Coordinates of C-alpha atoms and ligand atoms in Angstrom, one line a residue:
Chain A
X29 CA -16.1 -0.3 -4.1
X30 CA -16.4 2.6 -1.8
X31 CA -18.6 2.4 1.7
X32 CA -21.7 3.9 1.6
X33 CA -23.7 5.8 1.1
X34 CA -24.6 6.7 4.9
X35 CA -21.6 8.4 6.1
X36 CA -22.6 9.6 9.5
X37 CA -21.7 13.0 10.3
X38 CA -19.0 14.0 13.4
Chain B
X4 CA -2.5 24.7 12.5
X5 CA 0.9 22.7 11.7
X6 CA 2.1 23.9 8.8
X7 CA 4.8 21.4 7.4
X8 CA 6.8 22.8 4.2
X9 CA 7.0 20.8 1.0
X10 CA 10.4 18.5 0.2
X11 CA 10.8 18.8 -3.6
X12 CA 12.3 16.5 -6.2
X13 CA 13.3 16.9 -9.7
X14 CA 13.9 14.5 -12.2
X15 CA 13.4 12.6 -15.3
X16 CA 11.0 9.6 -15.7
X17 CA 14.0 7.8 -18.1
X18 CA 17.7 8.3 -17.9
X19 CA 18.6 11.7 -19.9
X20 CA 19.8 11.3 -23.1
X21 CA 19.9 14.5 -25.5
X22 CA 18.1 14.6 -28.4
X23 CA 15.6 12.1 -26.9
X24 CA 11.6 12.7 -25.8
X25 CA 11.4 11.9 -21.7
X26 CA 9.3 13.3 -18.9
X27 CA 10.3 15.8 -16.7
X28 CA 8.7 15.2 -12.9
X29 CA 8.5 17.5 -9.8
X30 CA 7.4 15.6 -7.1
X31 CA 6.0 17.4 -4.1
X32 CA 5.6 15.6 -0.9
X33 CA 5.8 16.5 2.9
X34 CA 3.4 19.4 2.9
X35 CA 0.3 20.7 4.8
X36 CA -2.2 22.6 3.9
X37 CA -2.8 20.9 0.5
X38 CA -2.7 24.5 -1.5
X39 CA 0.6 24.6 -3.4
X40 CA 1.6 26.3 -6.6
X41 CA 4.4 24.4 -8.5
X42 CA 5.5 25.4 -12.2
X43 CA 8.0 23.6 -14.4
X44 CA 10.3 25.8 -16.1
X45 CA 13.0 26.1 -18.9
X46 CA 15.3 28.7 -19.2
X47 CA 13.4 30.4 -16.3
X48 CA 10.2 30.5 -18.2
X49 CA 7.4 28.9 -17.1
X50 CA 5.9 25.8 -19.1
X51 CA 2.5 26.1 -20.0
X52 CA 1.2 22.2 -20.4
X53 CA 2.3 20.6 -17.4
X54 CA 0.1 18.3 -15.8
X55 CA -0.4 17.1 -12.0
X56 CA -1.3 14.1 -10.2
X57 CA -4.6 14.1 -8.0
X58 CA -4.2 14.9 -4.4
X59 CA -3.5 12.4 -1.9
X60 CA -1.7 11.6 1.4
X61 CA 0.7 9.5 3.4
X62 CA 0.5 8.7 6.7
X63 CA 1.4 11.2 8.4
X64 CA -1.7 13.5 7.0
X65 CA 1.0 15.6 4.5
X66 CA -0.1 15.3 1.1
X67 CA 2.0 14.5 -2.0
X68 CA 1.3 15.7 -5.8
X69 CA 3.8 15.1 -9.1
X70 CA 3.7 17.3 -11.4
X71 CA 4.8 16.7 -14.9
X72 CA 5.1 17.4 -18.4
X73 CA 6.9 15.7 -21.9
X74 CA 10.5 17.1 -23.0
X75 CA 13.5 16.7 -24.9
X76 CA 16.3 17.3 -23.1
X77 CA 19.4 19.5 -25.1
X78 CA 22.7 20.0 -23.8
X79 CA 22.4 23.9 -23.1
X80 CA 18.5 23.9 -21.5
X81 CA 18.2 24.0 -18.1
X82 CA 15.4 22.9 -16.3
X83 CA 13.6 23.6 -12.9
X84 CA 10.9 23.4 -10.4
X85 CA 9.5 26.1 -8.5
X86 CA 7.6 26.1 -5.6
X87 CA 5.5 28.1 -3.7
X88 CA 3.4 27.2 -0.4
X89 CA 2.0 29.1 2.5
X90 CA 5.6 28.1 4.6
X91 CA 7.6 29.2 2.1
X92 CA 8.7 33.1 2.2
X93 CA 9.3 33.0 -1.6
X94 CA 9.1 31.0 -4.1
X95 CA 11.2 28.1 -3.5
X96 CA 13.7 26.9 -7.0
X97 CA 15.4 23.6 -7.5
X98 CA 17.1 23.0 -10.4
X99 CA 17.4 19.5 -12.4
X100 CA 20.2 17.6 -11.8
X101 CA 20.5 15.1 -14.4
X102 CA 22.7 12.7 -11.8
X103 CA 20.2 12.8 -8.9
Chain C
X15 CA 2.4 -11.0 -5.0
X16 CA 1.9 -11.5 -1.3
X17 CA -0.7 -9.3 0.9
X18 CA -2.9 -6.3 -0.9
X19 CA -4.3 -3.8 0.1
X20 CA -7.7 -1.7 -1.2
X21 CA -7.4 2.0 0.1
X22 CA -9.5 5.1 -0.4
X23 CA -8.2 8.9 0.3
X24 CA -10.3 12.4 1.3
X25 CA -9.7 15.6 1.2
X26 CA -12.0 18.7 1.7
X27 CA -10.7 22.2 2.1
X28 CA -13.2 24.9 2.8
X29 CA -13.6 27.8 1.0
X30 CA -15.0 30.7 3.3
X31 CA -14.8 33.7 0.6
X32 CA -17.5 31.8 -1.5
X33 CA -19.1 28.7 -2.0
X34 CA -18.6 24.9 -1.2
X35 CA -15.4 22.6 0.6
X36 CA -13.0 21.4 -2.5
X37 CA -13.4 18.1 -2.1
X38 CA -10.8 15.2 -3.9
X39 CA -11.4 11.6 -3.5
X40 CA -8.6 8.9 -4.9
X41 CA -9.3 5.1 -5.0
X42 CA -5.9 2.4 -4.8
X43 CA -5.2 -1.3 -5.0
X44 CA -1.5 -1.3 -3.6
X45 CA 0.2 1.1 -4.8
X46 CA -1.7 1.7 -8.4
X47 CA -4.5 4.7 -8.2
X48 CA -7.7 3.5 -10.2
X49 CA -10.4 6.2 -9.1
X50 CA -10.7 9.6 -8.7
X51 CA -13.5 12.3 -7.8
X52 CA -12.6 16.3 -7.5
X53 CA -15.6 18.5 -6.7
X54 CA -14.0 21.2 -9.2
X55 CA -13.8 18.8 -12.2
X56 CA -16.6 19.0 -15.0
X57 CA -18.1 15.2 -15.2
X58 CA -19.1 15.3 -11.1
X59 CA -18.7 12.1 -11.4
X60 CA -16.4 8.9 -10.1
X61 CA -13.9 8.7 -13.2
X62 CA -11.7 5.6 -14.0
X63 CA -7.7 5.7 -13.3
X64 CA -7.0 2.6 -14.5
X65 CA -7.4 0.6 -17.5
X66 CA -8.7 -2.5 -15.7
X67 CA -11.7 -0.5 -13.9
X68 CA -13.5 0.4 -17.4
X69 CA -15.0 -2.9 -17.9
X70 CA -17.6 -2.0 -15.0
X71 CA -20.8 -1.4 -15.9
X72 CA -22.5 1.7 -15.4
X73 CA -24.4 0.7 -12.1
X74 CA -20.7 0.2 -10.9
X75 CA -20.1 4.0 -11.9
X76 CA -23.7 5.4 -10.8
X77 CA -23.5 4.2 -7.1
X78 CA -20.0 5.3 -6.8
X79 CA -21.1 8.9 -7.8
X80 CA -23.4 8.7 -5.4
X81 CA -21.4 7.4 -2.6
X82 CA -18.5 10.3 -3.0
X83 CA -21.1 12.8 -3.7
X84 CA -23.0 11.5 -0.3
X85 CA -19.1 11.6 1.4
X86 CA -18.3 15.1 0.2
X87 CA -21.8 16.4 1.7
X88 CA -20.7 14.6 5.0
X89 CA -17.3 16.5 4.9
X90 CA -19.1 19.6 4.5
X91 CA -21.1 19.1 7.5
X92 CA -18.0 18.4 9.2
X93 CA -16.0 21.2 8.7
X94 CA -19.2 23.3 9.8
X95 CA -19.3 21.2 13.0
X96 CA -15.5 20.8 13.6
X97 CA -14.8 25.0 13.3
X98 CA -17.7 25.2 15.6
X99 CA -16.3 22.0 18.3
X100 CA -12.7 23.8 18.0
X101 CA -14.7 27.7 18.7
X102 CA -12.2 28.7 15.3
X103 CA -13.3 32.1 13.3
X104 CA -15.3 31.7 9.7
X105 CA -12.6 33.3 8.2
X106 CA -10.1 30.8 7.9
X107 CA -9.7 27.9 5.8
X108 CA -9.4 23.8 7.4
X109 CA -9.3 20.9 6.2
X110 CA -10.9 17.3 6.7
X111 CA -8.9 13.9 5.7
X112 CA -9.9 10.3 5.9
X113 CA -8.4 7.0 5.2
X114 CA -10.4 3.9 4.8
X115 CA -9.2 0.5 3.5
X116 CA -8.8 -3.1 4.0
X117 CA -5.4 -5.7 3.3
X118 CA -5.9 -9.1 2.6
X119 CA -2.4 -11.3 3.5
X120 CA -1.2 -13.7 1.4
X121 CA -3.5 -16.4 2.1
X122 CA -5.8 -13.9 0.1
X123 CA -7.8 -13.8 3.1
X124 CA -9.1 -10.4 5.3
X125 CA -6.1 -9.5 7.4
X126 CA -6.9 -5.9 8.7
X127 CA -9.0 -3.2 8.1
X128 CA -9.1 0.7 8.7
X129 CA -11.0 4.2 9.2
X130 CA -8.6 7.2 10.1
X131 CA -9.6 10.5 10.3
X132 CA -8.1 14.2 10.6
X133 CA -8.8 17.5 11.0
X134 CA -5.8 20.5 9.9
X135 CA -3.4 17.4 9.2
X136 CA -3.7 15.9 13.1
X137 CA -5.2 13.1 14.2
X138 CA -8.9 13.5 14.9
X139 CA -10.7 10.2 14.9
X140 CA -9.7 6.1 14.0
X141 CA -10.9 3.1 14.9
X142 CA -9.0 0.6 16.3
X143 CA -7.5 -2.5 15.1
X144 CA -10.6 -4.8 16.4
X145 CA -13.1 -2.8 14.5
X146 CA -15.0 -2.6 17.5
X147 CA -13.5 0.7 19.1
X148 CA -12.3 4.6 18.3
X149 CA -9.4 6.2 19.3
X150 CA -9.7 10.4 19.9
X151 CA -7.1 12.3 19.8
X152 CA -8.9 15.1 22.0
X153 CA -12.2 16.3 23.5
X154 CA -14.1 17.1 20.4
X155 CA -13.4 13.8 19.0
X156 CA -14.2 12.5 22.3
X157 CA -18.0 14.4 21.2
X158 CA -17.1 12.6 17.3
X159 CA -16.8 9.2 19.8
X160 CA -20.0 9.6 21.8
X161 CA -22.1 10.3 18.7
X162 CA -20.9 7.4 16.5
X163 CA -20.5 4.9 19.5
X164 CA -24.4 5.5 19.9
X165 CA -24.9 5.2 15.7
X166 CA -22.7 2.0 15.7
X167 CA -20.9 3.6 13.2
X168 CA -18.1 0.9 13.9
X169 CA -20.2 -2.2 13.5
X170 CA -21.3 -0.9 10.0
X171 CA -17.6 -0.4 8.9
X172 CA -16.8 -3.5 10.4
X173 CA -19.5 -5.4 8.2
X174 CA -17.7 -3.4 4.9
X175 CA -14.1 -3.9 6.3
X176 CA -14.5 -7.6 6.3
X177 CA -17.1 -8.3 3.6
X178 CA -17.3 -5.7 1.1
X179 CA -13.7 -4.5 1.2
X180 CA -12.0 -7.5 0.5
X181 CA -14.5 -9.3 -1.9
X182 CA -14.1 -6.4 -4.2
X183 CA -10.1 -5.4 -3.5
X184 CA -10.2 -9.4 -4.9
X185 CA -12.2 -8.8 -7.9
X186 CA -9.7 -5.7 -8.9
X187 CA -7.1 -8.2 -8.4
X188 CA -8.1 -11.0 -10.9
X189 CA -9.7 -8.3 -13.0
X190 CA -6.0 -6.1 -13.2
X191 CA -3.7 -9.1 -12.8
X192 CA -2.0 -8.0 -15.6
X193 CA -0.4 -6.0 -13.7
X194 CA -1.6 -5.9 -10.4
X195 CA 0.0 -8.7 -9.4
X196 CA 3.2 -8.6 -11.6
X197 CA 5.6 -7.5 -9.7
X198 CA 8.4 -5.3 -11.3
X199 CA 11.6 -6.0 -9.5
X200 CA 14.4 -2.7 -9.3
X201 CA 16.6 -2.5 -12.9
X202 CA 19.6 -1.3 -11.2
X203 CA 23.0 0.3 -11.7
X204 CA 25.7 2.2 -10.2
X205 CA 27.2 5.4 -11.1
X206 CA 30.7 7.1 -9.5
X207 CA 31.2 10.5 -9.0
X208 CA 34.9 12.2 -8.4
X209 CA 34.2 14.5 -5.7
X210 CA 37.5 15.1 -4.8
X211 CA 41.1 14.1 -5.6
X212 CA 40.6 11.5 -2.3
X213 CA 37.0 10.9 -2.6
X214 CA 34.0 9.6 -5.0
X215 CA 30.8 8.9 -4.7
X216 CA 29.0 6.0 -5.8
X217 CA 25.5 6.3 -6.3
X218 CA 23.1 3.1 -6.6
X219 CA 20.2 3.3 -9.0
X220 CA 17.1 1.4 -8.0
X221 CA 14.5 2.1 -11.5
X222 CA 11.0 1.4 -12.8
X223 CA 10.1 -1.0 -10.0
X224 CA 6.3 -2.1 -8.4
X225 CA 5.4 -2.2 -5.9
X226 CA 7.0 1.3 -4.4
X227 CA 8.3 -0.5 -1.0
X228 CA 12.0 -1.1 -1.5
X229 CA 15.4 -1.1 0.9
X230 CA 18.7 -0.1 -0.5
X231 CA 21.3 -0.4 1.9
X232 CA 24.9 0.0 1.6
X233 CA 27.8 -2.2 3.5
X234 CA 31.7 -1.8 3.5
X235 CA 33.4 -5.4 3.5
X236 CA 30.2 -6.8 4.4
X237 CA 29.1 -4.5 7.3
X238 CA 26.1 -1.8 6.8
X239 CA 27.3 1.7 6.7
X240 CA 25.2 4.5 7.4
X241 CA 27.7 7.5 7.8
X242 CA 28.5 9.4 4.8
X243 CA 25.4 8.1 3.1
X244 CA 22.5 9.6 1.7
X245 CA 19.1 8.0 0.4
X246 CA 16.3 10.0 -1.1
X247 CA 12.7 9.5 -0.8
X248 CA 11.5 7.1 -3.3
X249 CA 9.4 9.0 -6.1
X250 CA 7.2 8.0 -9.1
X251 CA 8.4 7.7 -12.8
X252 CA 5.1 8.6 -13.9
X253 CA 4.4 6.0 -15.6
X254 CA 3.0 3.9 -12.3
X255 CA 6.7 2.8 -11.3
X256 CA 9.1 4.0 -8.7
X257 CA 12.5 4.9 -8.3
X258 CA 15.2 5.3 -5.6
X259 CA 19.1 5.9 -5.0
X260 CA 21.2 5.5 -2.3
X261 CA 24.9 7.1 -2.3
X262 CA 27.9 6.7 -0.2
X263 CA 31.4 8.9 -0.5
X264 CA 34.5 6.7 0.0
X265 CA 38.1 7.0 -0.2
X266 CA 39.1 7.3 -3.6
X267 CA 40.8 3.7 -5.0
X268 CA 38.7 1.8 -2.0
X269 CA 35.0 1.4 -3.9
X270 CA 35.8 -2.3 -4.4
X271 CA 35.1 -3.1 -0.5
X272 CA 31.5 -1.4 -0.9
X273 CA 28.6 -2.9 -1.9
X274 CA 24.8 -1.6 -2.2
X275 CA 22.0 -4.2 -1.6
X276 CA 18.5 -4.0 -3.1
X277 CA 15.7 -5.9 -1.3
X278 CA 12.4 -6.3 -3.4
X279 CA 9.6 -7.9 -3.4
X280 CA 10.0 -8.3 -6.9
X281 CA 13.5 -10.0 -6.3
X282 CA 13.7 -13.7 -5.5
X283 CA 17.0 -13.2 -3.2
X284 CA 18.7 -9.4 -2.8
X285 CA 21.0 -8.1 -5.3
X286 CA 24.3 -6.9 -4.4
X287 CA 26.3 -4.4 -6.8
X288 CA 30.1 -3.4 -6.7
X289 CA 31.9 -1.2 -8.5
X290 CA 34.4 -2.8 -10.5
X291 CA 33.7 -1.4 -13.7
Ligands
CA313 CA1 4.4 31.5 0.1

């Protein structure tokens, strides 16, 4: 199970 | 950036034995970028249904593929793997060694 | 079989001729891949690896989907930002990474957890062992740090790292056990080679074992010997084992005093081989 789905940008 | 230049291996899945079906494998490792061309080839021709491994990496960042395709080893084919990448002034041949 | 680890793997390339980052995406428990995603494949979706994966249900599939596809727009944005942070041209192609995964030990309890990321195959970005802090390699992941130390980007990983992670890395577990947690210990063998009238080789054979981690090491009347030996990388079967040799050349009519040894976890105590044959 993947994190997500907010992946915060760099 | 870093370029880093791919270490290649070529074998079979199962010990050779003539006659009998067994998996030739190219594995690819080492190497960044991730674009690479690699064909398997017999008699210095290349072979048309080979399949590949999805991308990944260790932990150093280079990636790794194997490519890969069925075959029946003889006692007069020869086998090999070439390689191209963006480190690599030509295309880059290693032959099967049926010992290594 | 001991400690386990659940690990996922990123890639996007950009593509500044025409059109959108390839992006790849590869799920494993241990050393047995289970999920892919590639941006250039038809389905756009999350697509099984594994036989043992299947069985979920299509919720399982759907929010996956829309996790990568949410991840692959993220790694867009970053190699927009990145080129920009790093004042590189628009004509040249770069490349994002990232790690992320957890291990549980072998009290099947959380025992680490981790977030790595890279830019053109260097370090860029990772967080630190307690979860709590980053590591930059430079000043533009210094300007990563200050932005995701102010989104608490680290305290929502953390959450997943401990929780999530591991609660899910041990439903694969129990789900796959059929072989997830067999192991399959080295079938081994050794082979001579005449290389000379006053030398051979001997070559030990380490074959279809799981999981990949193995140590072949050779000794002459029971002390290791690393001159004149050569080990190669260990490399896939293809079929979701590994393989390995190890060689050593010795004088020819002395192989008796030489012995490889094969550590495992698949092997109760090390083997030892000799060539007597
Ligand atoms: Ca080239």
């Amino acid at each position: 199970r993947q994190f997500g789905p907010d992946w915060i940008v760099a | 950036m870093i370029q880093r230049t791919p270490k290649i291996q070529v074998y079979s899945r199962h010990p050779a034995e003539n006659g009998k079906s067994n998996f030739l494998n190219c594995y690819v490792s080492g190497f960044h970028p991730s674009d690479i061309e690699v064909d398997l080839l017999k008699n210095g021709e290349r072979i048309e249904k080979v399949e590949h491994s999805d991308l990944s990496f260790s932990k150093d960042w280079s990636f790794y593929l194997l490519y890969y395709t069925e075959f029946t080893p003889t006692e007069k084919d020869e086998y090999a793997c070439r390689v191209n990448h963006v480190t690599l002034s030509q295309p880059k041949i290693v032959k099967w060694d049926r010992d290594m | 079989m001991g400690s386990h680890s659940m690990r996922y793997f990123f890639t996007s390339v950009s593509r500044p001729g025409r059109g959108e980052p390839r992006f790849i995406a590869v799920g494993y428990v241990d050393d047995t891949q289970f999920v892919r995603f590639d941006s250039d494949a038809a389905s756009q979706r999350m697509e099984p690896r594994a036989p043992w994966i299947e069985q979920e249900g299509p919720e399982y599939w759907d929010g996956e989907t829309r996790k990568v596809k949410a991840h692959s727009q993220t790694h867009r944005v970053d190699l927009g930002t990145l080129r920009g942070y790093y004042n590189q041209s628009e004509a040249g192609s770069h490349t994002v990474q990232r790690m992320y995964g957890c291990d549980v030990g072998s009290d099947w309890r959380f025992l680490r957890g981790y977030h790595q990321y890279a830019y053109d195959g260097k370090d860029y970005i990772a967080l630190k062992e307690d979860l709590r802090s980053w590591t930059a390699a430079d000043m533009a992941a210094q300007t990563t740090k200050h932005k995701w130390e102010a989104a608490h980007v680290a305290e929502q990983l953390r959450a997943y790292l401990e929780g999530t992670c591991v609660e899910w890395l041990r439903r694969y577990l129990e789900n796959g056990k059929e072989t997830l947690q067999r192991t399959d210990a080295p079938k081994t063998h050794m082979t001579h080679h005449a290389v000379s009238d006053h030398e051979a080789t001997l070559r030990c054979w380490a074959l279809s074992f799981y999981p990949a981690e193995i140590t072949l090491t050779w000794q002459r009347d029971g002390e290791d010997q690393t001159q004149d030996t050569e080990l190669v990388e260990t490399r896939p079967a293809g079929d979701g084992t590994f393989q390995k040799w190890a060689a050593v050349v010795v004088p020819s009519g002395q192989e008796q005093r030489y012995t490889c040894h094969v550590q495992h976890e698949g092997l109760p105590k090390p083997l030892t081989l000799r060539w007597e044959p």
